[PDB]
Amino acid sequence: NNVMASSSSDTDSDSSPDRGLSRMCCVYKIHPGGNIWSTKKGEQAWFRRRFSKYEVMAYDRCNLEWGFSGKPRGLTFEFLWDKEAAADGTC
């Protein structure tokens, strides 16, 4: 037919949703702009932008759910890393 290669799953999720002591959050890089933005998995975050805040909740497997916020299309969400929140519990 055609040379088909193996489409492996790069983004695989072997992660505990939250460990309490280690409240893991997803850290992304928002483009354009180059804004480092993180969202704590399991809770809702608000994407603070120039003239707007967008309600969005981060899932356990690291993926977002944008609410009625209706954030702009054409933005690039580059997943940087999975990290834990700060000592106060926020990321």
Side-chain angles (χ1 to χ4, degrees):
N1 185 272
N2 185 269
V3 181
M4 299 177 180
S6 304
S7 306
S8 311
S9 303
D10 305 277
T11 54
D12 176 72
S13 305
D14 185 90
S15 305
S16 303
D18 188 343
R19 287 172 292 239
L21 300 177
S22 51
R23 310 180 188 184
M24 267 62 185
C25 56
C26 299
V27 180
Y28 291 76
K29 193 182 183 188
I30 310 302
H31 287 268
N35 187 150
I36 303 299
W37 183 78
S38 309
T39 182
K40 186 275 184 168
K41 303 183 301 188
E43 301 190 85
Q44 190 180 31
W46 282 262
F47 176 51
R48 307 295 180 168
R49 193 181 182 222
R50 54 172 186 227
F51 290 91
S52 305
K53 50 71 182 60
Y54 307 87
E55 52 173 72
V56 60
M57 59 181 182
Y59 284 35
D60 64 301
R61 301 184 183 212
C62 197
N63 187 88
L64 296 88
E65 185 71 271
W66 303 79
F68 187 69
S69 46
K71 103 290 180 292
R73 285 293 178 181
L75 297 186
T76 308
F77 298 81
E78 185 177 289
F79 177 65
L80 295 180
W81 53 75
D82 183 270
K83 196 86 293 289
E84 61 295 88
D88 72 315
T90 60
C91 187

